[PDB]
Design a binder for this molecule. Structure first.
Ligand SMILES: [Cu+2]
Ligand SMILES: [Cu+2]
Ligand SMILES: [Cu+2]
Lengths: 111, 111, 110
């Protein structure tokens, strides 16, 4: 039917940990991720993306090629619809945060 | 025909390195990556995924929509098969580690 | 026409914060990203990839399965041309930097 994307935030801190004999140290990463990151559609069909923002703050969802640029508030849901009338690969990104904190995804429009 | 995915772990620490005049300082990133992250199939076909675990620890490979939940031991290869009976975009993730340490991928089932 | 990929570097340092009583340890993330990261093409396609390198350093673009392996200088734009003669999923990666700094992408054929 329609796509389902969940936006999650992760605050990871692992000073030291032995995982199956392997010790990992000084890990510190904070990120926001769109799950899933990639969406593939056929050129022409209308797209419906139900974005559920589970992040503690407002998150962005943009796709330049199709004038898509929304802002979903914390704990809110938002259906984003548009028509992929152009072929190619387009970056799905958050216009609100650093791109290497809230990692971008991809909208692929096949011929 | 048959997908090939390699799971790799990276333990990266760079105190300070000047590359072509640009300073790359205080880098500390630990991640596990599925190479490649995205698999694109068509609704209906029988998917075959040969997953080779090059990570020094056990790694997970999960895709809820198709009941896929596997653990690949360090240095082992496991072929994962399932039918993509439904269209859409589904997250490929590890159920053992933090999603922003072991970055997730996507299974795209197209009509 | 063809694919347009922009390569960007992110040098991100964020001091410790306290958001709604919740403390967030200082963050430090340095990455290089291909935007877009994924390319889906039909088998037998004469793929054209215009790669604009916005990174301040040389960036690599490789896809083993098709002999693709180029080095794009900082600020330059290079067009990659090859034919996707094989179906499957192939990693788009940079042979110059650690894979978890410059995150890999994917070339999907059919
Ligand atoms: Cu964001
Ligand atoms: Cu993992
Ligand atoms: Cu690079």
């Amino acid at each position: 039917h329609n796509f389902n994307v969940v936006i999650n935030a992760y605050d990871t801190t692992i000073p030291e940990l032995n995982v199956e004999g392997v010790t990992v140290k000084n890990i510190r990463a904070f990120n926001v991720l769109n799950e899933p990151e990639t969406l593939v559609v056929k050129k022409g069909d209308a797209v419906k993306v139900v974005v559920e923002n589970k992040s503690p703050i407002s998150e962005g969802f943009s796709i330049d090629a199709f004038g898509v640029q929304e802002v979903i508030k914390a704990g809110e849901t938002k259906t984003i619809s548009f028509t992929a009338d152009k072929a190619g690969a387009f970056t799905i990104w958050c216009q609100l945060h650093p791109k290497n904190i809230h990692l971008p995804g991809t909208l692929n429009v096949v011929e």
